[PDB]
């Protein structure tokens, strides 16, 4: 309050430069401030949520504004296969002359928007720049609304009471109904009123959306339940997305499968889809009691699930108490569920490409998947990091008297021993088989390889109709129960998309699928060995049982008792962030090298040269970095010269991380003394004396900043290589 | 398309905003 950390007086008394860094990194740590109690905490995170949401909508209004103003959006609408989607323009004063010829696309010098945004705005039904301006203003207004609320609920009499925050009971009555159920219903109110007619040629802007019904007859003879009229005449075959030719007029037809032409999902399928998800979520909103009293008390829902089998402790009696009073448990479930949702998003954006003329630009599809996978891994590691924060700064094993959680801390030894077992097994049985296949391929003999057919994935693709394997089971067999059971409904529009080898749906599978998917499960089980380790040994280990007393990110225990480098629950974060970047590494190298074989066409280039490691370092890193690393030559440059620069730049980020990760503090803490000796002793600079005393970075910060350069270097290197690689082999 | 606006906003937010914002935040350490 006096100086800097206007929030912690334990850091304002510090004369060093640690008051700055810990003043920054403990700013959002609202549970550890001067005198901020519970009401003063929820009444601050609730306002900062609004500030956050307004930052999100300021950002999306940013994309709407630059696409509205510097992009080539409607020219892209004219030819979505040919013209590249432009991002915002450039103003460098550093582009001398030869750079500008490598960026001119029309009058603009803009970047090429490799983020899939024109596809989604083209399936929404935005066919102009004018709607992008009205939308951008429509989100500047919304960000002003959210900043108004966060400023407004920190105004004192509008700061809501904590009993309102502990209406945990009824947020689920309103999120599942209002946020999820209504809005998705409202999103059908977009798709029925905008995306279906502006895909079927009818420009239904903001004028005739009440005078032109999306079905030619609607809602006066349609409370009678004659709902097959809304799925009467589908858009069958002979249609191009955007015009009115070859298209019917039904709204909610569930054909299943793709377009024949744009290789995306039907918008009738999405209108019916979000409509059904909307109805089911609105039904799920009627789940819990309120002031009315028709629902479920959550205490009666966790208290009742104590098994009389008796194996599962004294049941969940104690769990509802440690979700209301806790937050890091609730944030751990939030990041867990959001993270599995992101990985589901990533595993479906390529597999079932939703957006017209995606899977035709092979860079934006390659960036959306990798984007949501690295964000997926970040949010899992957040779920376990706040898991360990829950077990340290939030866990009460007296309200959790022999609870399910206390049972978890009881058998955490068996948990960590068996995670370490499966991780060891997969690490001797991916690396064993890749070094086997790589030695054997190296010794003039690709035949003596171990290739195991991944028959379980091939059988599961046979359960979804991929007839290219010869199992002839539930959907691959055309005479079975499920094959007849949806023979009219959605099968023949969908098995065409399955049995095709053009689309990225249910890919053809060699033993690279086997060896890589074991490598992925190695990554998941190592990363949960670490995270579940320093989330269950977050509280106390047999090295030091004092760990719960020191908080989350305490540095160490000194050299005592053998040495104690990185014992904290923050280490599990600190190490499983490397395993996060690694595991999402192998996921996206595998995906990206699978689709550089599909999109090129030579699937045999993958399946012959991916079962061993020089297949990866040869056929994928050495070959596909060739149009990258030719980004600028001593003969000139091209448009990839940004990424080939960034690539190199990112290596310089990555290895600077090692300077903090490898080489720890007491080197630098006795080197800053040489620098401060030399600054104090010299003339003409001893006048300019510091105020904060120069001190080397503390060993939680140092491992953290080395981790941050490891992430930024890693992710910028691979975002350089995805985009420069696919943008070099194509576009 | 007001093409002149990045020639104003990209310098006045790119360089002079992390000059005066260094002044506001760094004097704001001592306020």
């Amino acid at each position: 309050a006096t100086k800097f950390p206007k929030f912690s007086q334990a850091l304002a008394s510090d004369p060093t430069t640690r008051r700055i860094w810990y003043g920054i990194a403990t700013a959002h740590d609202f549970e550890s401030h001067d005198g901020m109690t519970e009401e003063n905490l929820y009444q601050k995170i609730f306002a900062s949520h609004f500030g956050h949401l307004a930052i999100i909508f300021l950002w999306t209004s940013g994309n709407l504004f630059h696409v509205a103003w510097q992009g080539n959006f409607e020219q892209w609408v004219a030819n979505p296969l040919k013209t590249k989607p432009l991002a915002h323009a450039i103003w460098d004063p550093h582009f001398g002359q030869a750079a500008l010829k490598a960026f001119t696309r029309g009058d603009t010098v803009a970047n090429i928007s490799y983020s899939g945004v024109y596809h989604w705005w083209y399936t929404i039904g935005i066919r102009n720049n004018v709607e992008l301006y009205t939308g951008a203003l429509g989100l500047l207004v919304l960000s002003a609304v959210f900043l108004l609320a966060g400023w407004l609920h920190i105004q004192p009499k509008f700061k809501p009471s904590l009993s309102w925050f502990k209406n945990n009971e009824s947020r689920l009555n309103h999120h599942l109904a209002g946020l999820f159920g209504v809005s998705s219903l409202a999103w059908t109110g977009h798709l029925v009123h905008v995306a279906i007619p502006a895909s079927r040629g009818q420009h239904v802007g903001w004028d005739n959306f009440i005078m032109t019904p999306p079905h030619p007859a609607g809602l006066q003879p349609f409370f009678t339940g004659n709902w097959s009229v809304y799925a009467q005449s589908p858009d069958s075959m002979q249609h191009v997305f955007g015009t009115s030719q070859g298209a019917g007029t039904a709204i909610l037809t569930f054909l299943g499968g793709f377009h024949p032409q744009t290789q995306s999902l039907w918008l009738t399928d999405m209108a019916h889809h979000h409509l059904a998800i909307a109805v089911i979520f609105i039904v799920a909103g009627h789940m819990y009691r309120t002031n009315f009293g028709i629902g479920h008390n959550l205490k009666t829902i966790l208290e009742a699930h104590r098994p009389p089998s008796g194996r599962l402790g004294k049941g969940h009696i104690g769990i509802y108490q440690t979700l209301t009073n806790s937050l890091h448990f609730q944030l751990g479930l939030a990041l867990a569920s959001l993270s599995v949702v992101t990985s589901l998003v990533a595993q479906h954006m390529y597999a079932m490409p939703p957006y017209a003329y995606m899977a035709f630009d092979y860079v934006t599809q390659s960036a959306l998947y990798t984007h949501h996978q690295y964000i997926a891994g970040l949010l899992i590691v957040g779920a376990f990091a706040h898991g360990a924060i829950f077990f340290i700064r939030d866990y009460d094993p007296e309200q959790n008297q022999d609870n399910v959680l206390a049972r978890m801390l009881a058998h955490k030894e068996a948990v960590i021993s068996h995670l370490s077992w499966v991780s060891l097994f997969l690490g001797f049985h991916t690396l064993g088989l890749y070094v086997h296949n790589d030695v054997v391929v190296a010794f003039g003999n690709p035949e003596k390889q171990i290739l195991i057919e991944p028959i379980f994935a091939q059988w599961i693709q046979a359960t979804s109709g991929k007839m290219l394997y010869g199992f002839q089971v539930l959907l691959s067999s055309s005479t079975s129960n499920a094959s007849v059971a949806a023979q009219q409904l959605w099968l023949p529009g969908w098995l065409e998309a399955v049995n095709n080898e053009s689309n990225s749906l249910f890919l053809t599978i060699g033993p690279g699928d086997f060896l890589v998917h074991h490598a992925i499960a190695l990554g998941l089980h190592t990363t949960t060995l670490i995270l579940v380790k320093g989330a269950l040994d977050a509280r106390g280990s047999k090295l030091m049982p004092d760990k719960k007393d020191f908080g989350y990110s305490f540095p160490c225990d000194g050299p005592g008792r053998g040495g104690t480098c990185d014992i904290s629950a923050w280490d599990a974060f600190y190490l499983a962030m490397f395993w996060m970047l690694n595991t999402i590494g192998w996921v996206t190298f595998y995906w990206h090298w699978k689709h550089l074989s599909l999109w090129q066409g030579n699937v045999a280039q993958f399946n012959e040269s991916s079962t061993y490691l020089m297949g990866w370092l040869r056929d994928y890193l050495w070959l596909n970095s060739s149009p990258l690393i030719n980004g600028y030559n001593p003969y000139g440059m091209n448009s990839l010269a940004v990424w080939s620069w960034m690539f190199l730049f990112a290596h310089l980020v990555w290895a600077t991380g090692f300077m903090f990760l490898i080489s720890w503090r007491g080197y630098w803490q006795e080197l800053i003394e040489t620098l401060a000796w030399a600054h104090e002793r010299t003339p003409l600079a001893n006048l300019i004396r510091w105020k904060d005393k120069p001190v080397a970075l503390s060993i939680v910060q140092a491992r953290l900043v080395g981790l941050v350069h490891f992430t930024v270097g890693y992710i910028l290197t691979y975002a350089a290589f995805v985009i420069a690689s696919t943008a070099g082999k194509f576009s | 398309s007001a093409s002149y606006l990045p020639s104003i906003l990209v310098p006045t937010v790119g360089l002079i905003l992390p000059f005066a914002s260094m002044a506001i935040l760094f004097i704001a350490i001592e306020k």
């Binding site: 900062s48 609004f50 301006y133 203003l137 002003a144 966060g150 | -």
Partner: peptide, 27 residues
């Protein structure tokens, strides 16, 4: 595609900037 809507845009996010500093100097 025009210029006046860009001015209207930076007006609305300038006001939104005043709500940003307005929220910022209370928490």
């Amino acid at each position: 595609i025009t210029d006046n809507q860009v001015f209207v845009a930076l007006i609305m996010a300038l006001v939104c900037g005043y709500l940003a500093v307005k929220l910022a100097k209370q928490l």
